[PDB]
Amino acid sequence: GRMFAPTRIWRKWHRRVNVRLRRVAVASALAATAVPAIVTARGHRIESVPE
Amino acid sequence: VKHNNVIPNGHFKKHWQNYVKTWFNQPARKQRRRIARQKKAVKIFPRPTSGPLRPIVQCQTRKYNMKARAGRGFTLEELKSAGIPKKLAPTIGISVDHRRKNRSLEGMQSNIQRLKTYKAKLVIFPRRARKVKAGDSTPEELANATQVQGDYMPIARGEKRSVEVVKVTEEMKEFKAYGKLRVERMNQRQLGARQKKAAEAEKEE
Amino acid sequence: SQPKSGLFVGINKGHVVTKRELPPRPSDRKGKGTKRVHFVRNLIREVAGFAPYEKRITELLKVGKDKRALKVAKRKLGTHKRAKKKREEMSSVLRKMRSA
RNA sequence: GCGCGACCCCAGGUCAGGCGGGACUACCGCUGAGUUUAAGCAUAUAAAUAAGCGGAGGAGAAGAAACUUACAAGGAUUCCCCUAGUAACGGCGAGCGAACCGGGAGCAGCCCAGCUUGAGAAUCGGGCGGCUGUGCCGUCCGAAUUGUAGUCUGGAGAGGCGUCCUCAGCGACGGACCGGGCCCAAGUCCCCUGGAAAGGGGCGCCUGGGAGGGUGAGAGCCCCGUCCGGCCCGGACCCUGUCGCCCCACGAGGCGCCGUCAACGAGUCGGGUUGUUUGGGAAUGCAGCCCAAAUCGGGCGGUAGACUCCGUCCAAGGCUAAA
RNA sequence: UUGAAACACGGACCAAGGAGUCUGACAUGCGUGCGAGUCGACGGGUUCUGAAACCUGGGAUGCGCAAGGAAGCUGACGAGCGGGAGGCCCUCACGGGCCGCACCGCUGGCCGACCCUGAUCUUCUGUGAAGGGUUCGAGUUGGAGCACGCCUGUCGGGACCC
RNA sequence: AAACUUUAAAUAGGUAGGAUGGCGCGGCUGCUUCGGUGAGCCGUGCCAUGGAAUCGGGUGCUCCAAGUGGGCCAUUUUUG
RNA sequence: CCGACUUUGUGAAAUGA
RNA sequence: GGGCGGAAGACAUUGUCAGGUGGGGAGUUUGGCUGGGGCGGCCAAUCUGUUAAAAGAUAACGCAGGUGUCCUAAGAUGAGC
RNA sequence: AAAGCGUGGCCUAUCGAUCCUUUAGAUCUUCGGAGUUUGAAGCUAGAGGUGUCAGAAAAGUUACCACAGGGAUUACUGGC
Numbered sequence A: 001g002r003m004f005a006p007t008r009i010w011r012k013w014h015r016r017v018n019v020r021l022r023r024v025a026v027a028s029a030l031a032a033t034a035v036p037a038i039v040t041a042r043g044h045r046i047e048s049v050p051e
Numbered sequence B: 001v002k003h004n005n006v007i008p009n010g011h012f013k014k015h016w017q018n019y020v021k022t023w024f025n026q027p028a029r030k031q032r033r034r035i036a037r038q039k040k041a042v043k044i045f046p047r048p049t050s051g052p053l054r055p056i057v058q059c060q061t062r063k064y065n066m067k068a069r070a071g072r073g074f075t076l077e078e079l080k081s082a083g084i085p086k087k088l089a090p091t092i093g094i095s096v097d098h099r100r101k102n103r104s105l106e107g108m109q110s111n112i113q114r115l116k117t118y119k120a121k122l123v124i125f126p127r128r129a130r131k132v133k134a135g136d137s138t139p140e141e142l143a144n145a146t147q148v149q150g151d152y153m154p155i156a157r158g159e160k161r162s163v164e165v166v167k168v169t170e171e172m173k174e175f176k177a178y179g180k181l182r183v184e185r186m187n188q189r190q191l192g193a194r195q196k197k198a199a200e201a202e203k204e205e
Numbered sequence C: 001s002q003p004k005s006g007l008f009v010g011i012n013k014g015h016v017v018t019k020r021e022l023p024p025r026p027s028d029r030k031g032k033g034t035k036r037v038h039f040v041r042n043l044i045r046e047v048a049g050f051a052p053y054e055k056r057i058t059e060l061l062k063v064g065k066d067k068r069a070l071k072v073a074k075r076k077l078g079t080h081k082r083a084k085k086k087r088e089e090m091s092s093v094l095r096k097m098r099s100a
Numbered sequence D: 001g002c003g004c005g006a007c008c009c010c011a012g013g014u015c016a017g018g019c020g021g022g023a024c025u026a027c028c029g030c031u032g033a034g035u036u037u038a039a040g041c042a043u044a045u046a047a048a049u050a051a052g053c054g055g056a057g058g059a060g061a062a063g064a065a066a067c068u069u070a071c072a073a074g075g076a077u078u079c080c081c082c083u084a085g086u087a088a089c090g091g092c093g094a095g096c097g098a099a100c101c102g103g104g105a106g107c108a109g110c111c112c113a114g115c116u117u118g119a120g121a122a123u124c125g126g127g128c129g130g131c132u133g134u135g136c137c138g139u140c141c142g143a144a145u146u147g148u149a150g151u152c153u154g155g156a157g158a159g160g161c162g163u164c165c166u167c168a169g170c171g172a173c174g175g176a177c178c179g180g181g182c183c184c185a186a187g188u189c190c191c192c193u194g195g196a197a198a199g200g201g202g203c204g205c206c207u208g209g210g211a212g213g214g215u216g217a218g219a220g221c222c223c224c225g226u227c228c229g230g231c232c233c234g235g236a237c238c239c240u241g242u243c244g245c246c247c248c249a250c251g252a253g254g255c256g257c258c259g260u261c262a263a264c265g266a267g268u269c270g271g272g273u274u275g276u277u278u279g280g281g282a283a284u285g286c287a288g289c290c291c292a293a294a295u296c297g298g299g300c301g302g303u304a305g306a307c308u309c310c311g312u313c314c315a316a317g318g319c320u321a322a323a
Numbered sequence E: 001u002u003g004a005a006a007c008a009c010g011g012a013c014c015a016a017g018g019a020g021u022c023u024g025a026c027a028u029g030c031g032u033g034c035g036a037g038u039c040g041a042c043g044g045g046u047u048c049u050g051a052a053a054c055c056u057g058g059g060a061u062g063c064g065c066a067a068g069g070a071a072g073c074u075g076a077c078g079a080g081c082g083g084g085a086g087g088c089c090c091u092c093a094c095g096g097g098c099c100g101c102a103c104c105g106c107u108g109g110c111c112g113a114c115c116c117u118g119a120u121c122u123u124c125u126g127u128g129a130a131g132g133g134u135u136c137g138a139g140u141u142g143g144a145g146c147a148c149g150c151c152u153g154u155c156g157g158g159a160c161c162c
Numbered sequence F: 001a002a003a004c005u006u007u008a009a010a011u012a013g014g015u016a017g018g019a020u021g022g023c024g025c026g027g028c029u030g031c032u033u034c035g036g037u038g039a040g041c042c043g044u045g046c047c048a049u050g051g052a053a054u055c056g057g058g059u060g061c062u063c064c065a066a067g068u069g070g071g072c073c074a075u076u077u078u079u080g
Numbered sequence G: 001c002c003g004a005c006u007u008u009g010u011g012a013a014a015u016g017a
Numbered sequence H: 001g002g003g004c005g006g007a008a009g010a011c012a013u014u015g016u017c018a019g020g021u022g023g024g025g026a027g028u029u030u031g032g033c034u035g036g037g038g039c040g041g042c043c044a045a046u047c048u049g050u051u052a053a054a055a056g057a058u059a060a061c062g063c064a065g066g067u068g069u070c071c072u073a074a075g076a077u078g079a080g081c
Numbered sequence I: 001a002a003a004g005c006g007u008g009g010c011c012u013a014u015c016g017a018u019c020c021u022u023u024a025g026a027u028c029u030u031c032g033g034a035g036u037u038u039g040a041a042g043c044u045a046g047a048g049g050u051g052u053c054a055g056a057a058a059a060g061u062u063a064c065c066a067c068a069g070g071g072a073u074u075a076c077u078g079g080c
């Protein structure tokens, strides 16, 4: 038979975010990279990088 | 229904799932239109990509009467008074609209000004190689023509916000503008009875 | 016609813009009757004759009962606007027949 | 006992041709339900749908206002956004529901019939023959005067005038899009486990190629490929790019002057009534029946009506890409 | 089911499949962005792994910023009291004073419906100094909203499954 | 004497038990009175040992929403 | 079943206008 | 003699409206309470007294009854009795 | 005479929503191109009625019967 509530193409595949909220998010993505401690905590091997 | 809510009004009683329109081909629409524009430009090299020219006109409809926008074509009267024949304006990239009417010198002269500027900055290649006839342009002029892109004449939509400072005259202060505004509402309301009373003066008096 | 008053309310309200007088267009003469077509329509009028309601309207006018002539013309033609002018044209055709 | 011309109509296995059927995504036309909702149900809703019957193309349909607006007005068609779940409509109940304005996508206008060769059918077809072969030419027969061609389409136009301004083709080489093929970097170097090394360890290399697949297990380097492009072949081409020879006119068009002409689509519009349809409400469309036009004229301005004024357009014929 | 061990129904056993989901409108609660604005959602430009991302327009697109009327139409002339968090002053402190957000209660003003009212001024039916109201508003004297996300609820959709 | 009552219980009902109170002074009124006469309000200054017992943080204010809307037994009053 | 309009033309008298 | 021969004849008849008939046919409805339901009754609106247990609320197809009206006076009031 | 009484009957029952039609009123508003001028819709307050009385427009039969259900509910048994 069918499945219960068969999936349909008109689910909400794409979601919207406020353009200013994308800009806020990308600014706070940049601002976190300028920190060696969080770049390290995110997993990258930074022990000979100069500055 | 149940607890306090706005009363439902869903139009979901027909077979709407047979007519749901999903937009997943939207990016491909954009890409297809872009290829279409690119190849139209390549075919119409070196004509301007914006296509033919358009008039400054006013919008209709009290909501928008104060906002200018682009029209469909210059009326026969503009094309005649600019020295740009009827049959030939679409030939040299000027639309023609046989249906419009001009009621104001201001609009007519504004559209003449657009025509004159366009004819100042238009360059036209000869129909043949060496035969330069009237309306063409010089070889050295033709050698520097490119495909101008975007809106080569932007239409300012509404008049600029200028807020200057002037004297407050007493002949300006004394003006009772609200009373003014009510008085011609009276004039409009009473225009029926006043002209009836008047016409009967001719009938009997 | 003459420009607006310039004040947003009232008799002939709106914004003042200098008015322009529009040169005549074709279809400003649209239907202006012409010599030859009046000829053509005259001749076939005489060759063909009159319809029965046209004849009855002639009779009502040659009696003089113009209200009844209008009323039957309306019941045939359909609208007051056409009934009145068909009555007017049959008054024309009846004066031009008593003229001689 | 005649020969005839036309008209209508026959039969022709006459010469040459065109039609039927098929697939269903989308498109056009007719037809057309009900379960359901309305907590019953009878109008309404389901639905101007499903089913039924037909027609095409690669898109189809629509399309150059007998349009909207009341503005400072706009200006063909189509689709998206908003208008708007709004005006409206509805046992004013459940419910139903568009449009103008504006923003975008794309933009393109055209051609007939009429009054207009009458010193002259200038038009078209078929047979036959010739060639330069999607045609063109010579000749015969025929269609057609119950009108083929030409000018004109309301933005006009026909005339008369005018200094004036605008008109022809053919080659050549390409460019562009389309298809197809051929080729294209680097370890299979040493040790172990293992049926197998594609695994572990060492030493190396490619990388505009670490997409992917194959191969006896986690393969960039064994194979096909992938990146960069290169080379050859063949199509359609009729889009445009540059070169050469041929030089465009008394004809057409444009521009300007004129005032005299200035023809525009009929059982069609319009009206009544009836059924359906619609958001369309004294009736939105459509259809039947009956009534039945006009040329100082006709249709609209979303409340039926008479009058005065105003704005607006010109139907009843046709074609038309793109979105 | 008021009451099941029931002389109430289903159930022999195992394996796998099997039932509140997805969508449009709304609502409260919460988070985030900005905040009298907020949305870039339909388009355009760009994008060398990209149906992604990024930029752009809006000067009026939606919602909000203003409501009352059926419609013509008119459209907020600037708030006091009681109680109160917390801050500050006096006292050695107990106790007192002042300023007093939010919120609750109270009494009013202003705009509009409806009624009432009329000095003046004007284009003679308009304006409206003054004064109003046991009535009415989903008002005002507090700008608080726009967008996205999520849970619950509602309603239409097959709509928890049979 | 359920559809009669003079009389008339018990249990159960309501309200009050202060800081949301009073008194002085000087003001408003378009109400009220013969009238500062009252009624109320307004500003200010004074008082008011917390005004019976016991107990104790509160639905105090609001939002969204679930399930439920078949009841049954007992002591006592009680209708067929 | 029935009336009116329609296909539906031609002309004659009698009563009504 | 340009009639194939008759009969009816602009009536029948076709088309469209209009009225009557039309279970031949279609669609649908056919209330609730109730000591099962049906019939009965209205205990569905609604009044007074009682049940109703000395505030209020309080049920049953409990009891005894009422109502769907009547009135320019049988309303207002003043005087007199 | 006046105090006062009087917004129906001495008090407790005697009655009616939406849509529609109709009526009363302002010297009211709209018919959205501007007017004159009938019609139409409005605004406020009534009436025409739903007695199943918070208000569908509505007769039977089925033994030929069908379905979803019910011990919320009868006829047999048992129980009080």
Ligand SMILES: C[C@@H]1C[C@@H]([C@H](O)CC2CC(=O)NC(=O)C2)C(=O)[C@@H](C)C1
Residues within 6 Å of the ligand: D091, I019, I020, I048, I049
């Ligand atoms: C004779 C009339 C009948 C009745 C009304 O017309 C019935 C309507 C009312 C309704 O609910 N919607 C309808 O379609 C029916 C009414 O008003 C009464 C006073 C009297």
Ligand SMILES: [Mg+2]
Residues within 6 Å of the ligand: A001, A002
């Ligand atoms: Mg399957």
Ligand SMILES: [Mg+2]
Residues within 6 Å of the ligand: B013, B014, B015
């Ligand atoms: Mg359905």
Ligand SMILES: [Mg+2]
Residues within 6 Å of the ligand: D038
């Ligand atoms: Mg139903």
Ligand SMILES: [Mg+2]
Residues within 6 Å of the ligand: D039
């Ligand atoms: Mg149901």
Ligand SMILES: [Mg+2]
Residues within 6 Å of the ligand: none
């Ligand atoms: Mg049913």
Ligand SMILES: [Mg+2]
Residues within 6 Å of the ligand: none
């Ligand atoms: Mg519909």
Ligand SMILES: [Mg+2]
Residues within 6 Å of the ligand: none
């Ligand atoms: Mg079908």
Ligand SMILES: [Mg+2]
Residues within 6 Å of the ligand: none
């Ligand atoms: Mg087409």
Ligand SMILES: [Mg+2]
Residues within 6 Å of the ligand: none
């Ligand atoms: Mg909205």
Ligand SMILES: [Mg+2]
Residues within 6 Å of the ligand: D197
């Ligand atoms: Mg190895």
Ligand SMILES: [Mg+2]
Residues within 6 Å of the ligand: none
């Ligand atoms: Mg592999």
Ligand SMILES: [Mg+2]
Residues within 6 Å of the ligand: none
């Ligand atoms: Mg290789």
Ligand SMILES: [Mg+2]
Residues within 6 Å of the ligand: none
């Ligand atoms: Mg290779």
Ligand SMILES: [Mg+2]
Residues within 6 Å of the ligand: none
């Ligand atoms: Mg149909």
Ligand SMILES: [Mg+2]
Residues within 6 Å of the ligand: D283
């Ligand atoms: Mg109709």
